[PDB]
Design a protein around this ligand. Structure first.
Ligand SMILES: *[C@@H]1O[C@H](CO[C@@H]2O[C@@H](C)[C@@H](O)[C@@H](O)[C@@H]2O)[C@@H](O[C@@H]2O[C@H](CO)[C@@H](O[C@@H]3O[C@H](CO)[C@@H](O)[C@H](O)[C@@H]3O)[C@H](O)[C@H]2NC(C)=O)[C@H](O)[C@H]1NC(C)=O
Ligand SMILES: C[C@H](N[C@H](C(=O)O)[C@@H]1CCCN1C(=O)[C@@H](N)Cc1ccccc1)C(=O)N1CCC[C@H]1C(=O)O
Ligand SMILES: *[C@@H]1O[C@H](CO)[C@@H](O)[C@H](O)[C@H]1NC(C)=O
Ligand SMILES: *[C@@H]1O[C@H](CO)[C@@H](O)[C@H](O)[C@H]1NC(C)=O
Ligand SMILES: [Cl-]
Ligand SMILES: [Zn+2]
Length: 604
């Protein structure tokens, strides 16, 4: 570690801890920079040479984290927990937490190489027919707009096999090294470490109580969609009393169902709320999408994207054939100057949502950039995930789409509302089970409840239990279907997205009230509300400097996650779906839990 980056001396008491903490933050900033820069260079240009520089940068970060962590342990291990300053308890008590820096060098190298090879496998996997389809855009477009059972099967099976199978051995090794590292910081396993970010001793119980209030909405949406699929694919491929085949829902993970909107839309005579075809008709490109997102943020008197954002970002899949990580992501370089998005943007309405989602992360980074590095975080991870989604709730309203030239006719009647809420439920309610289940899987794996010999059996257990989907071809433990989802090989926690999906409705409700809006919550558009903007800005400017419970309470008036705002937003279509399911004699749920569809006669 460079001499300039190493800790000096400080006194073994609270006032010393203060000086410790201040010089700690001041050095970390340069180490963060080199690390994220090496990641950028690799993720926008996947090469063996870039992966090596990235691994070298991560080793440097670990050496830094070891030297400062050990120092914090030498001075303060027996005394930081009774420190009078709460913030210091934690700008600090993080530092006593070495993570992978607890591993000896050989294992640090092995860990860092695993992350890099897992990322590379996921991002370079292809499905071969021999010309080859990538996840983004090729397989994505197939899952989105093909209606051919056999083609969807080909893409689903191809992807799961290509990404998942080679990841499995690496993932097992990763898991063991991760646990070994976090266990030396006093956690029972890595998932306990991940859960501790919520600083909530009843987190798991609280989540389960949330899920119980939301599950009926999901069950009704599921039965109605299942019937709409049955009408198209027939009695052989759809069981009205069984799980839905996992490839027929418009998305590789069945996690968002908005792409099958045209098959379930109750009132097709009303304005078509999927504006993708109008975006194409009009010549929208990636850069327009980012500009339109940006202008929503400035209408609230939040910050525009800086020059360095426009110069540095990767907003389209490169055409020079270069290999890139296509999964959309938002980047803070920790130098208070460079922030970027890397997205292989496609011109679709759900991509416009993703753009807002990503830009929400940038906005948070811009607002908190002057805080100590350790406090440059969301109040909890779910907060970072909710910012852009909140704005996207206003964006997607018919009234707002009309304002931006994407919906000619505006209607305000109960059928239009059902079509709108149904579309929003396909995006938001369908996701809830998947949001909750992914980290349940990973928590069981890190705790050892799910050994490698049950990785796929426990995955599909949870997939069926919560989502009520089934794999469209037989799977076995050679398959590693969880590794076919980005966040698993990329080692990014998932529960934040479940938290986000609930909290965004609480924020939306608060910002709508602050904007002086007085009609149904699902019609609210906070566009141009500088009062809504100021309230959002107070949250963004806080970073992680105060407990999330108190940031939440200031913003929305309650200090907990609460399903009530989402229920209230959805209440008209909740009641309509229950009435429709009842009139159609649907069975809620999937009591034929063992059913799987047959293979097509000529498969593949
Ligand atoms: C779409 O339409 C709804 C419904 O509008 C109401 O019902 C229709 C059938 C017609 O009778 C309309 O003339 C009628 O307004 C609109 O929602 C309604 O907005 C008004 C004001 O914009 C709300 O009234 C407010 O109520 C608060 C107390 O809650 C009072 O402080 C105020 O005096 C204020 O007038 C009204 O409650 C609200 N109705 C519902 C269903 O909540 C909606 O605004 C309109 N939206 C769009 C996008 O055009
Ligand atoms: C497309 C969206 N992409 C992610 C994302 O932006 O979250 C990317 C990839 C994983 C995290 N991520 C980032 O960019 C992070 N830099 C965000 C962040 C993490 C910690 C602290 C601050 C900021 C996503 O996966 N999503 C979106 C909602 C559903 C979920 C999915 O597609 O599975
Ligand atoms: C990609 O990385 C290599 C080194 O791995 C570098 O020589 C090359 O210029 C990069 N290409 C682009 C277009 O960034
Ligand atoms: C798992 O499934 C594949 C494809 O159907 C098959 O090749 C394999 O032998 C199966 N069994 C095991 C133990 O992998
Ligand atoms: Cl998280
Ligand atoms: Zn995000």
């Amino acid at each position: 570690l460079d001499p300039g980056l190493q800790p000096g001396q400080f006194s073994a008491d609270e006032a010393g801890a203060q000086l410790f903490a201040q010089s700690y933050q001041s050095s970390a900033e340069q180490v963060l920079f080199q690390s994220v820069a090496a990641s950028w260079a690799h993720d926008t240009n996947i090469t063996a040479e870039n992966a090596r520089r990235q691994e070298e940068a991560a080793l440097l970060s670990q050496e830094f984290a070891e030297a400062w962590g050990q120092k914090a342990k030498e001075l303060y291990e027996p005394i930081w927990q009774q420190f009078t300053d709460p913030q210091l308890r934690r700008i600090i008590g993080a530092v006593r937490t070495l993570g992978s820096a607890n591993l000896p060098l050989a294992k640090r190298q092995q860990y860092n190489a695993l992350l890099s090879q897992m990322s590379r496998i996921y991002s370079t996997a292809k499905v071969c027919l021999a010309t080859c389809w990538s996840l983004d855009p090729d397989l994505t477009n197939i899952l989105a707009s093909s209606r051919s059972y056999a083609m969807l099967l080909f893409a689903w099976e191809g992807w799961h096999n290509a990404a998942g199978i080679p990841l499995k051995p690496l993932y097992e090794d990763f898991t063991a090294l991760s646990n070994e590292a976090y266990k030396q910081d006093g956690f029972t396993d890595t998932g306990a470490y991940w859960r501790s970010w919520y600083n909530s001793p009843t987190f798991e119980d609280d989540l389960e109580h949330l899920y119980q209030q939301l599950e009926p909405l999901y069950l009704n949406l599921h039965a109605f969609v299942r019937r709409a699929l049955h009408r198209r694919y027939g009695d052989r491929y759809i069981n009205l009393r069984g799980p839905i085949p996992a490839h027929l829902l418009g998305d590789m993970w069945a996690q968002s169902w908005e792409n099958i909107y045209d098959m379930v839309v109750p009132f097709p005579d009303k304005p078509n709320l999927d504006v993708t075809s109008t975006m194409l008709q009009q010549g929208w490109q990636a850069t327009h999408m980012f500009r339109v997102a940006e202008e929503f943020f400035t209408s609230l008197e939040l910050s525009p994207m800086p020059p360095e954002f426009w110069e540095g970002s990767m907003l389209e899949k490169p055409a020079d054939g270069r290999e890139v990580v296509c999964h959309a992501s938002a980047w803070d370089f920790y130098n208070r100057k460079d922030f970027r998005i890397k997205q292989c943007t496609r011109v679709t309405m759900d991509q416009l949502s993703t753009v807002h989602h990503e830009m929400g992360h940038i906005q948070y980074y811009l607002q908190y950039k002057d805080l100590p590095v350790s406090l440059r975080r969301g109040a909890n991870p779910g907060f970072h995930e909710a910012i852009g989604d909140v704005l996207a709730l206003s964006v997607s309203t018919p009234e707002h789409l009309h304002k931006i030239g994407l919906l000619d006719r505006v209607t305000n009647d109960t059928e239009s509302d059902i079509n709108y809420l149904l579309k929003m439920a396909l995006e938001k309610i369908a996701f809830l089970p998947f949001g909750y289940l992914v980290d349940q899987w990973r928590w069981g794996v890190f705790s050892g409840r799910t050994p490698p010999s049950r990785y796929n059996f426990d995955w599909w257990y949870l997939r069926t239990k919560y989502q009520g989907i089934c794999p469209p071809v037989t799977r076995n433990e050679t398959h590693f279907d969880a590794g076919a989802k980005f966040h698993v090989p990329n080692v990014t926690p998932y529960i934040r997205y479940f938290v986000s999906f609930v909290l965004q409705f609480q924020f939306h409700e608060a910002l709508c009230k602050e904007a002086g809006y007085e009609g149904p919550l699902h019609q609210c558009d906070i566009y141009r509300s500088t009062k809504a903007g100021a309230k959002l800005r107070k949250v963004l400017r806080a970073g992680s400097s105060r407990p999330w419970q108190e940031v939440l309470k200031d913003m929305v008036g309650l200090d907990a996650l609460d399903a009530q705002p989402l229920l209230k937003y959805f209440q008209l279509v909740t009641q309509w779906l229950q009435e429709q399911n009842q009139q159609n004699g649907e069975v809620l749920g999937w009591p034929e839990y063992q059913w799987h569809p047959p293979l097509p006669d000529n498969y593949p």
